[PDB]
Structure 1
Amino acid sequence: KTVVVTTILESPYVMMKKNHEMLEGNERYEGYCVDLAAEIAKHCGFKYKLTIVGDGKYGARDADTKIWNGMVGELVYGKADIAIAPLTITLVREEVIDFSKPFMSLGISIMIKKGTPIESAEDLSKQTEIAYGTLDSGSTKEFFRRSKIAVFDKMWTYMRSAEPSVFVRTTAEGVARVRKSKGKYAYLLESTMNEYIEQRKPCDTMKVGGNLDSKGYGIATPKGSSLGNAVNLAVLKLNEQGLLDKLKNKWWYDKGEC
């Protein structure tokens, strides 16, 4: 049976080729996760169809209805067989699906517009002139809410009370906010996205400071899936053989623009 892969349209993980109207099926798309899906399938010996997650979401359980959205939802309700995407390995997700070991590492990080006199989280925490914030909901916002670290706690109390709101609706809005705010806004987002944008025109942003936490992206299959074991071994082999590092370099830097 053909394996149904769910993934998400987000550069540079999955894009539609410029000539996509000339192509069919899996060949319409390109990117990091497109290449990885190919390697995973080759190493596990399956045929697959790439599909884009219906609701454009990653995977969250609605606190009221208990329903899972996004790619995780597509796995647990049987719409797809495997998710290959920048999907963070988290406890609540691990409880309902299986994750491979991580294929990429990342953490919360600071994006500034080039020129901004900020080099770290401590720098942000001790001032208020350069506003800074996060997505208006999600794990990053929650990281700050629950932090007991002095710097991060100070950043959190600043963010919640700051006027006007320092929170944004989408990461795209956050990046745009940095870019148009004339050095007066910094945005807190995944290091992977931060590092990618730094290599996109007009090359006006920069990742600064170390990551504030650590996590990884993992390939997700449903509990008891016949694919889980082989997929996991595949990730480790690709890492050990240098392929994941080669793939990140390809999509972030060789194809960079700055």
Structure 2
Amino acid sequence: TVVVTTILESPYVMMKKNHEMLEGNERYEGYCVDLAAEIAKHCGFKYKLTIVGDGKYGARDADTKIWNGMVGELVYGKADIAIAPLTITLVREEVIDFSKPFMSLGISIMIKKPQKSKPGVFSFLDPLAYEIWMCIVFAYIGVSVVLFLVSRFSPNEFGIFNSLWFSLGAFMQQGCDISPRSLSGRIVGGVWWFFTLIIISSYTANLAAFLTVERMVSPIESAEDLSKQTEIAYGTLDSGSTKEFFRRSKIAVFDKMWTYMRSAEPSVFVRTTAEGVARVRKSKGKYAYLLESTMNEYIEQRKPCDTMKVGGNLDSKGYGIATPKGSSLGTPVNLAVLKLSEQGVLDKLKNKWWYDKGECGAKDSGSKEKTSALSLSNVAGVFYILVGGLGLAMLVALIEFCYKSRAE
């Protein structure tokens, strides 16, 4: 009777393992398969699912005007009914009819879900801000300055070269041989002692908080951070909606997109959705793939779990049944679309099929971690400051010999 045109994409149309073994009509399973079983039943018709041989979404060719992938089977009459995840757009509706939307979707960003980021060489000073480290320095100066001035007007081992050394080890938790032996002096060392005792305890407590609780970094989100960050390479699928909708960029943010989307190398587009899944997993911070929302949702729910949806829908779009213009069975479908939507067969099977394939959620966030031993990379910059301090130490040893030899 009727000819079904569609394409195999998860979770819509999915081949199982044993399609060579047993076919029946169960070569393909999914939400879109059973929704086609609903819409054929409510119309009464019986289907022949024929996925297109070229295997593309498709559009009419630029300057050649030939409908490519599923639009070729739908316009040129070799297929009639189309239960397919295809975008309703203007030039889509211009040549052939569509039904009501399956669901409310839009363009979503797919990034790699990051692992533990690499700390820098100076990541040891992470619990304290630059201002606090700087305020310690001027405090370290001013205390020994005061101790120099306190020891000036009272009868003397406390030179300006000496009082630096006392206040340093007091900050470094080390005891010193010479102690103040004056009331005004011992006030200054005491408040300096009570200073550092807070600070060392403060640095220890914040550092445990970084180790125990971990916060995850999302460098790019909400599509404005995409517009500023131009080290990420955007990706979409061509021969379809995301190509032309950004080719029809009119918002100033989308203009900054499409100028950069044309000026990119080499992945201005890709040609397979599963490739754009694989390419982001190989990209690792350099590249991103914009696509349909519920696809990015679903691939996140299939568990390699290294993916993430950020931001939100950049458009409002809907999946409707494509029918040729002046369809034999369009208005039969149009009523039977309303028969699905009136009680939510569109809702209820989508309730089932979206949670069906397993979940990637708060299951692995809770108790799939152990804190590790500290890497050398955590504490590496301490050694470079150490050996760099060792390198500077030998240099002062040489220039000591020069000014000592000028006692001639």
Out of 142, 146, 152, the position equivalent to 2:244 is 142
Q: 1:138 to 1:29 in 2, by over 3 A?
A: closer
Conserved? CA contact 1:110–1:208, under 8 Å: yes
Shift of 1:183: 2.7
Q: How does 1:1-258 map to 2 (within 5 A)?
A: 2-114=1-113, 116-135=218-237, 138-163=240-265, 165=267, 167-257=269-359
Contact 1:13 1:33 in 2 (8 A): yes
Contact persistence 1:100–1:219 (CA under 8 A):
yes
Cα deviation for residue 105 of structure 1 reads 2.2
Number of paired residues?
255
In the alignment, the residues of structure 2 paired with residue 164 and residue 18 of structure 1 have an alpha-carbon distance, to the nearest angstrom, of 34
Residues 87-143 of structure 1 deviation map (CA, whole Å, 9 limit, x = unaligned) = 1112222222221111122211111111x4222211111112333332355432333
Decide whether the 8 Å contact of 2:111 with 2:307 is kept in 1. yes
Displacement after TM superposition at 1:247 (Å): 2.0
The change in CA–CA distance for 1:206 and 1:256 in structure 2 (over 3 A counts) is same
- CA 1:206–1:227 in 2, change beyond 3 Å: closer, same or farther? same
Closer, same or farther: CA 18–210 of 1 in aligned 2, 3 Å:
same
Contact 1:3–1:49 (8 Å) recurs in 2: yes
Q: Would the alpha carbon gap of residues 143 and 76 (structure 1) be closer, same or farther in structure 2, given more than 3 Å must change?
A: closer
Q: Distance in 2 between matches of 1:63 and 1:161?
A: 19
Residues 18-68 of structure 1: CA distance to partner in whole angstroms, max 9, x if unpaired? 232343342222111111110001111111111111221224112344322
Per-residue CA distance 1:173-217 (angstroms, 9 max, x = gap):
222221122233221111121111111121111111111111111
- 2:7, 2:51 within 8 Å by CA — same for their partners in 1? yes
- Residues 134, 65 of structure 1: alpha-carbon distance in 2 compared, 3 angstrom cutoff: closer
Q: Distance in 1 between matches of 2:79 and 2:263?
A: 42
Aligned-residue identity in percent: 98
Displacement of 1:163: 4.7
Evaluate the alpha carbon distance shift between residue 155 and residue 36 of structure 1 in structure 2; reply closer, same or farther with a 3 A threshold.
same
Instruction: Say which is worse superposed, 138-147 or 104-113, in terms of deviation.
Output: 138-147
Task: Return closer, same or farther for 1:218/1:45 CA change in 2, 3 Å cut-off.
Answer: same
- In the alignment, is the contact (CA less than 8 A) between 1:98 and 1:223 conserved in 2? yes
Give 1 or 2: higher strand fraction: 1
Compare 137-146 and 173-182 and name the one that shifted more.
137-146
Contact 1:40 1:234 in 2 (8 A): yes
Q: Secondary structure at the match of 1:25?
A: coil
CA distance in structure 2 between the aligned counterparts of 1:5 and 1:37, rounded to whole angstroms = 9
Q: Structure 2: where are the runs of 5+ without partners?
A: 114-217, 360-408
TM-score (norm 2): 0.58
User: Closer, same or farther in 2 for the Cα pair 1:171/1:214, shift >3 Å?
Assistant: same
> Partners of 1:166 and 1:73 in 2: how far apart?
24
Sort the Cα spacing of 1:65 and 1:10 in 2 relative to 1 into closer, same or farther, 3 A: same
Deviation at 1:164, TM superposition (A): 5.3
CA deviation after TM superposition for structure 1 residue 149, in Å:
1.9
Structure 1 residues 143 and 63, CA, compared in 2 at 3 Å: closer, same or farther? closer
* 1:25–1:49 contact (8 Å) kept in structure 2: no
Q: TM-score, normalised by structure 1?
A: 0.89
Q: Is the 8 A contact 1:81 1:221 kept in 2?
A: yes
Give yes or no for contact 1:110–1:120 (8 Å, CA) kept in 2.
no
Post-superposition CA distance 1:200-239 (Å, at most 9, x none)? 1211111111111111111112223221111112222212
Aligned-partner Cα distance in 2 for 1:162–1:224:
42
- RMSD in angstroms over aligned alpha carbons? 2.0
Q: Partner of 2:26: helix, strand, or coil?
A: helix
